[PDB]
């Protein structure tokens, strides 16, 4: 996982402000990446199995969707 | 308009998605890797908004672990009720 | 500020739905001449060359 460690501390930072945050714990970025992790996890898996669903071995945008469209209704 | 880095990002997608796939590498759309990214970013901001608004309610105005672990458990809620 | 608070989560929350059925609109298109990106390596091409997603042109044609 030296990946989600990758997303950066001023991404985080970034992020939090746009969502109207003006000051973080320092205990908020693992926080945010284990988020991302779970978010990632559940939208790919159904992209991906999606793809494959449709004998494809690009995954499209339209694939994407798809998995937004699942992710959003569960 | 992008918040995070595209590359870090694709490659956490990338690591994410392999383990799906045999350990073979399905290769994306650049639309859907921006896909994919835009919808995290507006998750996580979203995310954000409401645990912050906890924050607010709480008194304070640094966000703090326990104001995100409470906004995840009430879009449970949310999402279980209506 | 208990009522305010559950205002400004349903507010909230909405914003979220206008902006995912927004990005589902926009996405949900072939989009069949755009470039593919190489996983396996996080590459892919362009009119300039051969370039890193997110990354420098990494080959000049």
Redesign the interface.
């Known amino acids: 996982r030296d990946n989600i460690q990758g997303i950066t501390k001023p991404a985080i930072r970034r992020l939090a402000r746009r969502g109207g945050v003006k000051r973080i714990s320092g205990l908020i970025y693992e926080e945010t990446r284990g988020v991302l992790k779970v978010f990632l996890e559940n939208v790919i898996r159904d992209a991906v199995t999606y793809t494959e669903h449709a004998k494809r071995k690009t995954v499209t945008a339209m694939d994407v969707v798809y998995a937004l469209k699942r992710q959003g209704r569960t | 308009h992008l918040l995070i880095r595209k590359l870090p990002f694709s490659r956490l997608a990338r690591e994410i998605c392999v383990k799906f796939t045999r350990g073979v590498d399905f290769n994306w759309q650049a639309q859907a890797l921006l896909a994919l990214q835009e919808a995290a970013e507006a998750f996580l901001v979203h995310l954000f908004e409401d645990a912050y608004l906890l924050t607010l309610h709480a008194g304070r105005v640094t966000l703090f672990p326990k104001d995100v672990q409470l906004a995840r458990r009430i879009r449970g809620l949310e999402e279980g009720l209506g | 500020?208990?009522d305010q608070?559950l205002q400004?989560?349903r507010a909230?929350?909405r914003?979220?739905q206008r902006?995912?059925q927004r990005?589902?609109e926009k996405?949900?298109?072939?989009?069949e001449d755009?470039?593919?990106?190489?996983?396996?390596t996080?590459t892919?091409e362009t009119p300039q060359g051969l370039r890193?997603?997110?990354?420098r042109l990494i080959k000049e044609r």
């Open positions: 500020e208990d608070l400004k989560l909230s929350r914003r979220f902006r995912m990005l589902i996405y949900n298109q072939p989009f755009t470039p593919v990106v190489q996983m396996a996080l892919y890193i997603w997110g990354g």
